[model samples]
Target chain A: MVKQIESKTAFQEALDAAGDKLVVVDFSATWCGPCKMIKPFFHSLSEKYSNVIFLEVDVDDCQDVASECEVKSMPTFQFFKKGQKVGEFSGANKEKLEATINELV
Target chain B: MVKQIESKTAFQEALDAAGDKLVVVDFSATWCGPCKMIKPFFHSLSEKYSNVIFLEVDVDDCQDVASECEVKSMPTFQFFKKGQKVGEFSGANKEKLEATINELV
Candidate 1:
């Protein structure tokens, strides 16, 4: 299961704790339609990619984290490696997300 | 990963194909917020319960299946065993859903 980041501190801790692991952060909301549609796909991706650390941050729960990340929309997937932002995209394209993850991995 | 039943026939086929294994079906919609919130949980459950067959039916895409299942809401979970419906409930309570699956499994 993907880890749920409840606060800004926890989010930062997660990134800092992940030294060389790819941390895939899913910026989503409870009410966002696209976020919901792509959630299962994201969860499955987490299952498939054991090497990556999957994190889910609900914007409503972590406003500071969302703000810091500059999440303009729901379902923004941001990838971080070595504690640095490496890739990002918005929307619910399952193929594109998987392809991007594949490229990074 | 959960198998998506795109059509009514496919749904029946899934049920028929599952000889003695338990089949857990999630009836959901794209626009439903609660449906999205519970989606990742549901997906993770699928990974945990390997002995069970996880199926997802989009209410819009499988109207007949939803109708036949008497789905009245956005997110309804139904459990089947030996090709017969055995349990059902509404809402996205993670603990309750997990407990129900645990009891059944």
Candidate 2:
């Protein structure tokens, strides 16, 4: 299951807790159609990739984190390592999305 | 509704029939996970943008058309105006995908 970060504090805490692990944060919006399509897939990925730290942050719910992350688009997947953002991409292409995660791992 | 082209001849015929209208061809495959996610959105786009000719071609079923289009990835969207490819992109991001179509129009 994907961990939901409801607030800026929670977001930071999650990242801090993640330490040096590969954290995959899904910056999504409730109204985003593409986000809805990939929600289940993201959850399934959390289950499949046991070593990855999966986090979901609703851009609307956590505007501070969204702005901090400089999220310019909905359904942005950011990869973090050692409490720093390493890379990111915006889209819902399952294969490409997974390939990105795989590359990071 | 999006017209389904099952063969190379059908693909060319669809493009020729489209004439000078903006033809949006979705080069996809059955095994492509992202293609399935975007299929419904592509159909809805056809209805919304009635002026544009929307087409769906399975790369597996229409290898010749796929080769001619030089589809390097699954869910490749190619925009054609006057039977000439104007632009293309590959992804399932609804906003960016629609933005591309809107820009061409």
Candidate 3:
């Protein structure tokens, strides 16, 4: 599921609940144009890798998780495994995104 | 590697480090006969599934983690997917252990 994280508690729950699966959190804003552009690609990757738990968090919705990940931009991607930060970046580079996921997952 | 978790800290570290893999923690003791019998089977599983993290926790060593899993028996197999406990069983049944791993991993 290309889940959209709504609360800080659920975010913590998801991270804690992720045992062996890689969790990729997309830090995006609703009004961000770039975030919208890469939405499809991000969702597609979630579909491709069932082993990976893909989640999107609106920076506006939860600044606690967003700022902790140091997201100062529109389309920042944070990859986490077992609640530990592993991979991350900003922008809408589908090739780069796919490459990072391939390397990690 | 068929890892024997010595400390609570390292046990936690390994669990957090397990990303997109399955972690099987064998809650065993030195005095338990069944635990000894299944030792080889557990080690063999670690070799077979590199994607699955195999760990052994001596109840005497780490009672905190052991008690959390409710290890009242000699050999308890606890299966975790993400940070949540997905499956668990008592005794040293090789078939049952393999079945749980197959379903989770």
Highest-DockQ candidate: 2
Select the stronger candidate by TM-score from 1 and 2: 2
Q: B56-97 in candidate 1: lDDT tens per residue?
A: 998667766766786654478999998888999887789988
The candidate, 2 or 3, that scores higher on DockQ is 2
Give the Cα lDDT of each candidate: 0.83, 0.81, 0.80
Q: What stretches of model 2 exceed 4 Å from their correct place?
A: B1-105
Largest lDDT belongs to which candidate?
1
What's candidate 1's i-RMS value? 11.7
DockQ of each candidate's interface versus the true one?
A: 0.02, 0.03, 0.01
Q: Tens digit of lDDT per residue, candidate 3, span B1-95?
A: 78888887898788788866788889876545677789998999888898899999987677667656655555788887666678888888999
Candidate 1's residue-wise lDDT over A1-105, tens digit each?
Answer: 699999878988999998888899998866556777899999999999988899999876776686678665457899999879999998788998888888887
Tell me the lDDT of model 1 at A83. Answer: 79
What TM-score would candidate 2 get against the native? 0.51
**Pairs with steric clashes in candidate 1:** none
Estimate candidate 3's RMSD in Å.
18.1
Ranking by TM-score: 2, 1, 3
Residue B76's lDDT in candidate 2: 83
- Model 2 interface RMSD, one decimal: 14.3
- The CAPRI quality class of candidate 2 comes to incorrect
